[PDB]
Design a protein around this ligand. Structure first.
Ligand SMILES: C[As](C)(=O)[O-]
Length: 646
């Protein structure tokens, strides 16, 4: 009966009273595995800070009959479900958290939090009277992620936010069980990682004079300098902070496009280096792919990135190389292509990509990039198609194009993360990508044969920050759609349930409030038409039926037990809404229940749901829903009447 996001894989509920943590509760580890013992450490720290309860770490053994304890077990039975899987068994006897790997224990604790009162997150107030119940009944949860790659990307190149903000984001990701922080740290307007060998990357590339505002080509600027970067010490700190919360950081060093800041720092890197770090978001500089100094410089940068980022994957971008504006007609390019037998500029980038792929593999890492690296024309910049094949080991993040191109790459052996930008770009508005569209996202590309599904490792949702300058606006854009993507990445496809997710989002938004996340507040539509796809329809209204105020719909077959039934009068189309006065339930020819409140069902839906109390059914009787409504200012109105049971 709890509201964890993401919805877990398997839950079984039992009757009775729930487990409750009290001042007498203990945290007991029935294993001496150091990784499990560590998770007990921060679980204790985290739980006690939130609840105010002592929760002492006590030796494997005697718990008190006075209070349920938390018992941590290492159980290999969930090994086949992967290193993030866990189990929870909760009753007044005890709260058992089990996992094959220590990482599952951390996720078990995040689930535990979401089954307790949201006041847990409150930084103030007296909590000594809170009842720290674990949900409302005993239960057993077995949980594991559907996808191994559940990523959130934060663009700090366009606007820098810094350590405090990124850790607040990491906190949200952890609570939602998202496990990849994709860190977009370089681009045309900013370079945010200090490189010791090349100090100008930050001394120059991390500064710009002003920022375009509003939108692309707005003609508006803020006239305010913007600067900032991370030191290697700060990165090491954030890496550890995120890793303790089950998150691997994937750094992105943009190349060969999106490279203005790097070029202004060291102008030999580009054949068309700008005069200063761009102040608008429409300048896209490309590295020089024909020069040896380019690859040597980039390899040096990746050495220092390798040293401070432990993750196996290094993202090198590759998107949106403006071939026609950067390389076409340049003598270095044209001679290099003739010298190498290349017929198109996509051959140039493919040569760059495959050389960067080997440089990355020699450092013990694996490259990832946006799907332009696959070598097909994605943006229509005169690039053509690449004749040589992309390195099979390269990971592709698919953001743009017909998904048959993604499936081609998969069938060529590539692992693929689905980031189709018409669903996953959180910088877009809520009209462009509604909450419902984020939740409806399916990372497995349609029409991909089952034998290839294991190549789809997961998804990533992107917070690009051209138009985001404060943490509060970052939250407005990222949340709550990031909550939907967390569920897409974790919950089994067959357990997804958008109306249930919307209800759960209400409690989760209390946590976001107490945690300081300024999420968008009027974006959850209380009623979406798709919510009723599997709900009995008992009638319609048309212009013809709007000649009368009273309307009767048979529900005799649907009244099978006592209890509440919700009637929804849901506008479909037409110039006019209906105005609803009351809805009633009749047994035979006599009223047995009425909900009289004013409703209006049109483009806007105001109180269109009516609750009827059915008696235990009388055998042999009929039941009829009678609804009083009329056209609002006219009779051009079409709608559907739905009848829901408990
Ligand atoms: C053009 As973009 C994906 O860097 O906002």
């Amino acid at each position: 009966q709890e509201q964890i996001i993401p919805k877990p894989a398997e839950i079984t509920l039992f009757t009775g009273s729930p487990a409750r943590l009290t001042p007498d509760s203990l945290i007991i580890t029935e294993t001496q595995d150091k990784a499990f013992l560590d998770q007990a450490g921060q679980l204790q720290q985290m739980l006690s800070a939130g609840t105010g309860l002592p929760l002492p770490l006590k030796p494997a053994g005697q718990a008190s009959k006075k209070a349920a304890c938390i018992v941590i077990k290492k159980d290999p039975a969930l090994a086949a479900r992967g290193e993030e899987a866990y189990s929870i068994q909760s009753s007044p006897s005890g709260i058992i958290l089990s996992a094959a790997d220590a990482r599952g224990i951390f996720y078990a604790g995040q689930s535990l939090v979401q089954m307790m009162p949201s006041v847990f997150h409150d930084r103030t107030g007296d909590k000594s009277a809170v009842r720290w119940n674990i949900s409302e009944t005993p239960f057993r949860i077995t949980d594991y992620p559907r996808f191994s790659w559940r990523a959130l990307m934060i663009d700090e190149a366009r606007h820098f936010f810094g350590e405090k903000t990124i850790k607040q984001i990491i906190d949200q990701m952890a609570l939602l069980k998202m496990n990849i922080l994709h860190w977009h740290l370089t681009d045309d307007t900013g370079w945010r990682i200090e490189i010791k060998k090349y100090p100008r990357l930050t001394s120059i590339g991390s500064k710009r004079r002003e920022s375009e505002i509003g939108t692309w080509n707005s003609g508006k600027s803020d006239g305010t300098p913007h600067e900032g970067f991370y030191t290697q010490e700060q990165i090491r700190d954030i890496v550890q902070y995120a890793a303790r919360r089950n998150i691997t950081i994937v750094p992105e060093i943009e190349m060969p496009g999106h490279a203005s800041a790097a070029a202004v720092a060291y102008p030999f890197l580009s054949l068309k280096t700008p005069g200063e770090v761009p102040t608008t978001f429409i300048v896209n500089t490309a590295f020089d792919p024909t020069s040896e100094k380019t690859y040597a410089f980039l390899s040096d940068v990746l050495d220092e990135v390798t040293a401070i980022f432990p993750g196996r994957i290094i993202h090198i971008g590759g998107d949106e190389v403006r071939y026609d504006k950067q390389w076409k007609g340049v003598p270095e390019i044209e001679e290099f292509m003739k010298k190498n037998g290349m017929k198109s500029y996509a051959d140039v980038q493919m040569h760059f990509t495959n050389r960067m792929s080997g440089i990355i593999a020699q450092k013990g890492r694996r490259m990832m990039g946006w799907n332009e690296i696959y070598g097909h024309d994605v943006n229509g910049d005169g690039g053509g198609k690449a004749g040589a094949k992309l390195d099979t080991n390269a990971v592709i993040q698919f953001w743009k194009g017909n998904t048959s191109l993604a499936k081609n790459a998969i069938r060529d052996g590539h692992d693929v993360i689905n980031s189709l930008h018409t669903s996953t770009y959180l910088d877009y508005s809520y009209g462009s990508i509604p909450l419902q569209k984020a939740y409806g996202f399916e990372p497995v590309f349609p029409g991909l044969e089952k034998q290839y599904h294991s190549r789809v490792k997961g998804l990533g949702a992107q917070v690009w920050t051209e138009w985001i300058s404060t943490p509060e606006r970052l939250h407005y854009q990222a949340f709550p759609r990031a909550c939907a993507f967390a569920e897409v990445g974790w919950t089994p496809a067959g357990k997804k349930d958008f109306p249930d997710f919307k209800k759960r989002l209400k409690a989760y938004s209390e946590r976001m409030d107490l945690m300081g996340i300024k999420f968008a507040r009027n974006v959850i539509s209380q009623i979406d038409k798709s919510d009723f796809f599997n709900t009995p329809r008992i009638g319609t209204w048309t212009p013809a039926t709007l000649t009368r105020e009273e309307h009767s719909f048979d529900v005799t077959k649907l009244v099978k037990a006592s209890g509440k039934h919700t009637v929804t009068l849901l506008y479909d189309k037409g110039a006019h809404a209906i105005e609803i006065e009351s809805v009633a339930l009749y047994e035979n020819s006599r009223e047995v229940s009425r909900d009289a409140h004013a409703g209006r069902s049109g483009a806007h839906k105001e109180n269109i749901q009516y609750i009827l109390n059915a008696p235990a059914p009388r055998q042999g009787a009929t039941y009829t829903v009678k609804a009083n409504f009329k056209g609002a200012g006219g009779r051009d109105s079409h709608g559907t009447v739905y009848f829901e049971t408990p």
